[PDB]
Design a protein around this nucleic acid. Sequence first.
RNA 1: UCACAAGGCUAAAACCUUAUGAAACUCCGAAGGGGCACGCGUUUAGUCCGGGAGUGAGGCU
RNA 2: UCCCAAAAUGUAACGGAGGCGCCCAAAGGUCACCUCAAGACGGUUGGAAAUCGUCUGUAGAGCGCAAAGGUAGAAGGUGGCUUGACUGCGAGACUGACACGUCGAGCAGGGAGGAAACUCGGGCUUAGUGAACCGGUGGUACCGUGUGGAAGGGCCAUCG
Lengths: 104, 177, 84, 136, 54
Amino acid sequence: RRKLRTRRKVRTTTAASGKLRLSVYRSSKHIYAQIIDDSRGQTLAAASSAALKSGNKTDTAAAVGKALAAAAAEKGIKQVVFDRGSYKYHGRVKALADAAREGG
Amino acid sequence: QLKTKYNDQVRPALMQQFGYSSVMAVPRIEKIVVNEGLGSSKEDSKAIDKAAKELALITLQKPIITKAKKSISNFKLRQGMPVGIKVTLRGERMYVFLEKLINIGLPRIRDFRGINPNAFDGRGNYNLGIKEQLIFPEITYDMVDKTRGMDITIVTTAKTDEEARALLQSMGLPFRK
Amino acid sequence: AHKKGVGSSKNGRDSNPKYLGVKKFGGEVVKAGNILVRQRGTKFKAGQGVGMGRDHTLFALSDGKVVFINKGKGARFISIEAAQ
Amino acid sequence: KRTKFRKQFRGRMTGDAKGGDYVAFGDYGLIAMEPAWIKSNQIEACRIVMSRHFRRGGKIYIRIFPDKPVTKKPAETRMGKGKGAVEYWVSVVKPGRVMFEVAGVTEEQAKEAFRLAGHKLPIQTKMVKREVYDEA
Amino acid sequence: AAAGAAPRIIVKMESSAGTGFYYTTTKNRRNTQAKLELKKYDPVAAHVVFAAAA
RNA sequence: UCACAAGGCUAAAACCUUAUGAAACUCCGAAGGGGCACGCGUUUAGUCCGGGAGUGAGGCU
RNA sequence: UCCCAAAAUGUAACGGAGGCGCCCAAAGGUCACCUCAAGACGGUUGGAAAUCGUCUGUAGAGCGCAAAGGUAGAAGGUGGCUUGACUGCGAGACUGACACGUCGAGCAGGGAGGAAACUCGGGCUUAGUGAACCGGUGGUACCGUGUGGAAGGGCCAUCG
Ligand SMILES: [Mg+2]
Ligand SMILES: [Mg+2]
Ligand SMILES: [Mg+2]
Ligand SMILES: [Mg+2]
Ligand SMILES: [Mg+2]
Ligand SMILES: [Mg+2]
Ligand SMILES: [Mg+2]
Ligand SMILES: [Mg+2]
């Protein structure tokens, strides 16, 4: 049910790992990939898609994953830890990954 | 297959009979669900070979072996053993197997003026399991051993029981009178 | 006559003490390696700074000071925070 | 009287009586004054006593109940080798706590049936009538 | 251990290396009935794979 | 959780009103008790290293 | 293990209950995924209990065995790959008269699962144990008596 999301949410040992949380919302056809210091209740990146995506749907992945990692490299935020929620990591969000996994 | 468009003959058959606000707000039918529960006594490799062939030829779908819920009553029971077989049929193959019923299962029934029209799932859904196996388009005595029986439970997103009643009936179902 | 009994006993058994309870309390310092709590289960939950051996012992990952919190009755952690 | 199944064994302690010091079930009610113990037969006593007096038959409420296993070692052994087998059963009646409620008879029947009842017990006692109204 | 015990017999794991080495543990013998193949370290090099020696 | 006083009600088990007992029950839960700190205010002891021991049957409110 | 034990650890009794001397090659490491006991209605064998279905459903279950503490964001249930049930160590503490015993970050060599951050030097934990001595065995080349060899002995391992 919720279970999976809160499961990964805690296997992101909130702040104690030191690094930066990396959200997603690939459950709609509007996503939301985010960047959090989670300790400080703030968000530091933000690659939306609702202000015009491109035209693609799940090809959009690598793209907002390149836009995010771009806004990151700009901010200075140079290190990853990949949150999700109800997501398998395999296809769409996996693209977002690969092109964030080298995209910032 | 066509029973799809038949569902769609029902969609405003009741959207124009009732007075609903919408077309998705009218009872669909998630899954048909078949339970081949031999069990309690029957503990032979052959009757599950048989229940397997049977289920997999009649509904063209692999059967899942439901085991003993660790229920080990005074009689013959234990822990890890097949006491019920299951095949969930939904959407496409649901509509196909249900049509296999109303077309080539319901008349084939030896002695049959319709089935139980008393209020089933008080939430407004349905069940209906039925004995006999020798009333079939697939289950042949020339392809089996002795006689068995099925137990079926159809789920309908009805709010109350009259609405499921109506649904099931306008869909092609005899309610004995 | 007098008494012959004959009864015995079948109990009179116990196990040598397991020194449980919270060892390092709340508001005192610590060193790294120092154990802060012994327990049977998760009577006290690993907080931010603290680790949990197989026993569910709570040990300190680095020095500083000890911080207890019960979460409104039934869920509870100890954490560490330095001297700055 | 006795109970059905349990733990087996016990101990003892005192300090005043919890509840229920109030006159439910009946109009008239008899109330302990001493931190006694009370036994199966000690109460079956008053059962049969009052149940003599009321005839056919009243309405009789035994507000107490034996749950305590009391032991005695086998007579004549030096201590050790065990705890005593269960001799008898005990209701640990503390003071102000009310033991008997009856009605379905009059004032005289309460006075007397309670008099005869209380002449069977290790305690001074006071009988009374309702008004204890925290919860009926 | 307890001598006349037939299940969970204590037998050692000799390296395929020949280093001159052996580990020591316990199979249920209501299990393997043939031998045992495990992948432990080996000081006299690095990573051998061991046969459950007699 | 085991126990158990009356009554409801059904086919009794549950469950409702009324009701109570518990070392191995606990929605709750003090007074005290202990660790750490401070010494904000008094007082004297403490701790380590090395020599010599004795005691290891206790008794009463 | 649980009361007794007087809200800190501790504490006797021929006081009050009960359990261990194993088990696990997967029941461990990792990775991923699933959620429980029951009651009501309704359903072929059945029909108290089997199987399926729905509404309820924070624990009223489950954890190999004893109970207490613990647990649903899993320790519970299912699969993929797997040999961290690993040598060389040990910051710092729990505990004990001693001897023991208990937890452990982190470092190295070298691995395992993840895509990763990671996690692992056995299992939810607390029982599943026997100090020396003498001897068996697999390494090891420290000792070996005028000398170089071998007996024998030492060290690591380990078995009774
Ligand atoms: Mg309240
Ligand atoms: Mg002595
Ligand atoms: Mg003394
Ligand atoms: Mg005390
Ligand atoms: Mg003493
Ligand atoms: Mg000797
Ligand atoms: Mg040798
Ligand atoms: Mg030699």
